[PDB]
Swiss-Prot record, chains A, B:
Disulfide bonds join 120-187, 152-166, 177-201. This is Alpha-trypsin chain 2. The modification Sulfotyrosine is found at residue 135. The chain holds residues 127 to 247 of 247 of the full protein. The record marks 175 as: Required for specificity. It comes from Homo sapiens. Changing residue 118 to M: In a colorectal cancer sample; somatic mutation. The active site is at residue 181.
Amino acid sequence: IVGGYNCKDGEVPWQALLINEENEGFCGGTILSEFYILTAAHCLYQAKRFKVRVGDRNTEQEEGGEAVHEVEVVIKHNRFTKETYDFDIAVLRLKTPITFRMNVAPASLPTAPPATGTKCLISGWGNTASSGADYPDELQCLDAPVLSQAKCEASYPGKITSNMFCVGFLEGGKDSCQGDSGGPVVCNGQLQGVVSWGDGCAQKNKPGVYTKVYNYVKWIKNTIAANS
Amino acid sequence: IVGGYNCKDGEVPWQALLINEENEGFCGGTILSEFYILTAAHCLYQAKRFKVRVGDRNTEQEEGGEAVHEVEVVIKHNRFTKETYDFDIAVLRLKTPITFRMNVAPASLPTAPPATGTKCLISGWGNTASSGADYPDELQCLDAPVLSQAKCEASYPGKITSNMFCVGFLEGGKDSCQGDSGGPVVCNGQLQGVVSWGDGCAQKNKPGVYTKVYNYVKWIKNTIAANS
Ligand SMILES: *C[C@@](*)(O)[C@H](CCCNC(N)=[NH2+])NC(=O)[C@@H]1CCCN1C(=O)[C@H](N)Cc1ccccc1
Ligand SMILES: *C[C@@](*)(O)[C@H](CCCNC(N)=[NH2+])NC(=O)[C@@H]1CCCN1C(=O)[C@H](N)Cc1ccccc1
């Protein structure tokens, strides 16, 4: 996240982090239920083996800590292709269920498409620098408005599908970035997006492009039920 | 199919054949609907590119011929592993829907588990020789009884899961074989199995092992709905 702030305690209970073999974070995730995590399909090929980490170390407000989970089944949307980065969505099934608490809870699937102007909360452990590499020690948060499809399409001519939507600032300075992929975009209490891609990070007229979760509610629900 | 007979005209309307780059058949399939085909997950790695062929050339009884379809989406059961060959099931989505007729129709999913002793019809274009390679010019058919789980487990100690069942003859001589994988096992009008694996072909005390479709009704239905 570029130009964000240190998330306040208990602000993103549904946040998950994918960690590689070297115990390093490379992508985000969203808790959907005790066994399921939502992330980006493109994160699946950015590492051979990985686990999922949820929770936090702020025991002052609530005890429990961070919990690392092993992934039992990886279910990538079969229509994903890096040619367009369309269908950049995947569902993970953990070996052991997550023990929920007030600061570790699932996100709500959307019941209506995202509305232009609506404020959303984007979070992640990804790069905080427009140019260069500066990763945070604390989870980052960013409040950004949903952009009209017209401005989105105008930003990425012919590269925006119906399964994508833009969130951010046309003037640049604040956006998600590398490592944030898979992370949540929560607008008014609903999970409206998954961090996906963009031209650079926080560039002028180059807002972050997100997977429109509303278009995948049926795929997520049935995929989980097919494997449950 | 070893020790079978030339299927009679219109006997297996739901039969599908997977063909590789060289236009050669390497696996079977079952028509489930106009856009979906059921086959074995292990067939997916036996060829890079492939298409699906349905229909027949017996225009005497009905016109239409054979139709070759391109595969749009391949949906393999994510729990499949060649370590056990458990979850040997996959669903294919065609680019163009199949034009049904009396001799080209979908199979019925099961509503009850397979019963011991029940007669089933197994079909395929696979090898017809116990030892050696002798492929048929015509679709082969085989009528075989469902074996008790006890005899099945006794045939393959510790290798039979709850998602598998045996069909065939303990004395050998008649069984499915290489190339038949993915093909249908229809008992009393219901699709009860998918050709999967076995120790050799038509060997004594080594009956064919099939994917128990009844255990996957939920996975098939929801997977199709998740992608439809
Ligand atoms: C995997 C995710 O961490 C990451 C998120 C980037 C978010 N960026 C902004 N500005 N909000 N996604 C990616 O790295 C994706 C997947 C791989 C390629 N990709 C991109 O974002 C490319 N930079 C997009 C691209 C633009 C022009 C030409 C080729 C690719
Ligand atoms: C892919 C299918 O055409 C084919 C069907 C064989 C059916 N045989 C009988 N007797 N009904 N399946 C296979 O070839 C599968 C998948 C790959 C391995 N395999 C086997 O059947 C092996 N021969 C099973 C095996 C036995 C002992 C040790 C290792 C493997």
